[PDB]
Structure 1
Amino acid sequence: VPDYHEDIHTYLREMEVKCKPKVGYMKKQPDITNSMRAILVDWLVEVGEEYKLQNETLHLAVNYIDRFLSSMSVLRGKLQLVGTAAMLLASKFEEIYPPEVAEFVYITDDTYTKKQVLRMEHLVLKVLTFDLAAPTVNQFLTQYFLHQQPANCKVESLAMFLGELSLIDADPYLKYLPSVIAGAAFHLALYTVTGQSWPESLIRKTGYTLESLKPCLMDLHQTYLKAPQHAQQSIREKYKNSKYHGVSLLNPPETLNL
């Protein structure tokens, strides 16, 4: 409803800044690594598939994980617990029918008790000061999609797919805002599929040009090219499904020619 589209876009971009995880945090994490996070994220994706959760839910969940880990140091054995509580929070916020707590206990192969998942939930809530309505790459893309002429299901799914990859690797994606990853995502999808670029209307909309997105575009392009070889593969599998028009099976462009 374009009656508010611009009020909203402007707001999400003020809020993405306030909601940004601290870019430096893993260096300050004694016991966990980018690699252990990517494993965690990759499991969340899987959980997402197993309970047919919204992509938005996944992204939110991640956001909560990065922000929680930005001030709370956690032992590797507890990282999954943070992740479980975060997904249960993200589900309660975003989903019509959230999986019940038992379902979250279960998918840790009972690594953790109910009470444990639920005291973690309370702790994320406090660390995040109940601030759960965070902008995500998903909310940006979905706005950017309005600017297609005509819309193209493959582009959308491809965009969704790359924005999704970007959750997996804290290096480098923790230093890019939602709005920017979404921009690189959409430019990359559009180009891959159709050969077009970031439309002039999104420059007017977002103030971002190719030039601004380049840094992120370079990272993302490499993540695209290397995805078949990544340690984590759940997104690739997810994105073979008919629901996302099998875009993980589309070949990345060999060059971006910026």
Structure 2
Amino acid sequence: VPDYHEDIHTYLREMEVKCKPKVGYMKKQPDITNSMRAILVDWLVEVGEEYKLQNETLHLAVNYIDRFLSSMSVLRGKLQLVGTAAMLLASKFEEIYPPEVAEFVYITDDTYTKKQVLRMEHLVLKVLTFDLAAPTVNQFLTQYFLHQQPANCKVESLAMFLGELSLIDADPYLKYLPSVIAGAAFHLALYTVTGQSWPESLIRKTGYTLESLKPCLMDLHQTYLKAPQHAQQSIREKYKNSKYHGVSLLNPPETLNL
């Protein structure tokens, strides 16, 4: 394990900057909105629950969608096709057995055809120039977790939770690198469960001081307070499972000592 940990961490920091979406892209989209995008991401959380997809697969699909909508305009009626191809590609790259194309066609409710989805798959590949090995919040969270003492797994779930939350809203979240979001999610979860705080280990590793996390943490802390209200409820319903120690039942802290 720890012969490459740091090489890996360093290199994921380099890749994540290559794989960053254009941040003010939703404004250049004449027919789609941050809010439609929230509808699509939430639906992806459900498709992933249903087919027992890994969480990584969801973060990947979200990254592809955002790099795609970054250079290509899409009418509202095709947004979901872009989403479905994205989910298919993320599955092939990350999953052991990806659900077949029929299955993906099936879960849009035969709203596109198996050949439309495949032509979309090709076109996503072309636009992303086959760059699919994208660093996600889930990746950085996984690296971060090696530095927690002792391991708390209510801490882990709750962090994963917050990191999935941030996928829903391009509204603030496209401003932050995945390593920064993973940072605030880790701190926020550590904090909420135990009252402890973004550890020195990780300050020295990431060169991120608690202070630098403060802007992202504030938005994240807002997202976490307002979660029970948000138009989209999929990630909460997911994170109620015993598999996740019902962390999304837990009580957000109302202040942060920040």
SS of residue in 1 equivalent to 2:30: coil
CA offset digits 1:144-164 (Å, max 9, x no partner): 111110101100000000000
Alignment of 1:1-258 (within 5 A): 1-258=1-258
Shift of 1:105: 0.1
* Separation in structure 2 between the aligned mates of residue 138 and residue 256 of structure 1, nearest angstrom: 23
SS of residue in 1 equivalent to 2:162: helix
* Separation in structure 1 between the aligned mates of residue 59 and residue 257 of structure 2, nearest angstrom: 30
Q: TM-score, normalised by structure 2?
A: 1.00
* Separation in structure 2 between the aligned mates of residue 166 and residue 198 of structure 1, nearest angstrom: 19
- List alignment gaps of at least 5 residues for structure 2: none
Q: TM-score, normalised by structure 1?
A: 1.00
* Separation in structure 2 between the aligned mates of residue 219 and residue 233 of structure 1, nearest angstrom: 18
Shift of 1:242: 1.1
SS of residue in 2 equivalent to 1:99: coil
* Separation in structure 2 between the aligned mates of residue 239 and residue 106 of structure 1, nearest angstrom: 25
Shift of 1:246: 0.7
Shift of 1:94: 0.2
CA offset digits 1:225-257 (Å, max 9, x no partner): 000000000000000001111101011001011
* Separation in structure 1 between the aligned mates of residue 194 and residue 92 of structure 2, nearest angstrom: 37
CA offset digits 1:104-131 (Å, max 9, x no partner): 0000001100000000000000000000
* Separation in structure 1 between the aligned mates of residue 13 and residue 257 of structure 2, nearest angstrom: 28
CA offset digits 1:80-111 (Å, max 9, x no partner): 00000000000000001110111000000011
* Separation in structure 2 between the aligned mates of residue 18 and residue 157 of structure 1, nearest angstrom: 28
SS of residue in 1 equivalent to 2:248: helix
Shift of 1:53: 0.3
CA offset digits 1:18-65 (Å, max 9, x no partner): 000000100000000000000000000000000000000000000000
SS of residue in 1 equivalent to 2:32: coil
* Separation in structure 1 between the aligned mates of residue 217 and residue 238 of structure 2, nearest angstrom: 23
Shift of 1:201: 0.4
* Separation in structure 2 between the aligned mates of residue 147 and residue 154 of structure 1, nearest angstrom: 15
* Separation in structure 1 between the aligned mates of residue 134 and residue 142 of structure 2, nearest angstrom: 15
* Separation in structure 2 between the aligned mates of residue 114 and residue 97 of structure 1, nearest angstrom: 18
* Separation in structure 2 between the aligned mates of residue 60 and residue 182 of structure 1, nearest angstrom: 15
SS of residue in 2 equivalent to 1:70: helix
* Separation in structure 1 between the aligned mates of residue 78 and residue 86 of structure 2, nearest angstrom: 13
* Separation in structure 1 between the aligned mates of residue 252 and residue 77 of structure 2, nearest angstrom: 36
SS of residue in 1 equivalent to 2:225: helix
* Separation in structure 2 between the aligned mates of residue 203 and residue 226 of structure 1, nearest angstrom: 28
* Separation in structure 2 between the aligned mates of residue 209 and residue 89 of structure 1, nearest angstrom: 36
SS of residue in 1 equivalent to 2:13: helix
* Separation in structure 2 between the aligned mates of residue 129 and residue 144 of structure 1, nearest angstrom: 30
* Separation in structure 2 between the aligned mates of residue 107 and residue 75 of structure 1, nearest angstrom: 20
* Separation in structure 2 between the aligned mates of residue 40 and residue 5 of structure 1, nearest angstrom: 34
CA RMSD of aligned residues (A): 0.4
Shift of 1:171: 0.7
